[PDB]
Amino acid sequence: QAEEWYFGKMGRKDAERLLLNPGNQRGIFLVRESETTKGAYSLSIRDWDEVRGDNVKHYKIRKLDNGGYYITTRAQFDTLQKLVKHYTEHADGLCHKLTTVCPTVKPQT
Amino acid sequence: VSSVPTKLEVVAATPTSLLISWDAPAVTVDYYFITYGETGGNSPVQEFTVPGSKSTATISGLKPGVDYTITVYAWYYYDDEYYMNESSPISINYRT
């Protein structure tokens, strides 16, 4: 859905480049359409690690035949909004809990 | 090829801290997701990660005389389509 975290059609490396902007802290995230599985989404998250430094991890959001959405089959959600809320409450396997949506440059006012 | 870790166990234990250990699967693991919480407790579990190169983890700040459920999941790359997958869990219980 056209929610604040939804970036629509966006490639993996472009999502990485945007998330890796200086100023973004760990847990900054976006949701985009998957370019490798049709009908799936990807949750892209800014992360940090002792060895690799600043980095980005991607999690595929797959669709259930009758149910809803999941990254791991043990945690299933009726909507993408419920998935995002869950992973904002607890990381529950993700590299980091979701904090706020990846910022983008807006027109000057 | 195995992605589930095996033979999870506590290998050192004080009243408030545990060292857990397992056998890595044959797939290269990116990181492990570890949870622990009072068995049947009505608070949320604690969660953390360790690097995929490891096969042990230190849990601290436990309450003495509480049964804890401890679970380990491997998060790993399969191929470019399935780039980030969670393994089946392995779990143990331990009373401090």
Swiss-Prot record, chain A:
It comes from the Eukaryota. This is Tyrosine-protein kinase Yes. It is found in: Cell membrane; Cytoplasm, Cytoskeleton, Microtubule organizing center, Centrosome; Cytoplasm, Cytosol; Cell junction. Disruption phenotype: Knouckout mice show reduced OCT2 tyrosine phosphorylation and reduced OCT2-mediated TEA renal secretion. Knouckout mice are protected from oxaliplatin-induced acute sensory neuropathy. Mice are viable, fertile, and display no apparent phenotypes. This lack of phenotype may be attributable to compensatory roles of the other SRC-family members. Residues 5-102 form the SH2 domain. Interacts with YAP1. Interacts with FASLG. Interacts with CTNND1; this interaction allows YES1-mediated activation of FYN and FER and subsequent phosphorylation of CTNND1. Interacts with CSF1R. Interacts with IL6ST/gp130. Interacts with SCRIB, when YES1 is in a closed conformation; the interaction facilitates YES1 autophosphorylation. It comes from Mus musculus (Mouse). Belongs to the protein kinase superfamily. Tyr protein kinase family. SRC subfamily. Non-receptor protein tyrosine kinase that is involved in the regulation of cell growth and survival, apoptosis, cell-cell adhesion, cytoskeleton remodeling, and differentiation. Stimulation by receptor tyrosine kinases (RTKs) including EGFR, PDGFR, CSF1R and FGFR leads to recruitment of YES1 to the phosphorylated receptor, and activation and phosphorylation of downstream substrates. Upon EGFR activation, promotes the phosphorylation of PARD3 to favor epithelial tight junction assembly. Phosphorylated. Phosphorylation by CSK on the C-terminal tail maintains the enzyme in an inactive state.
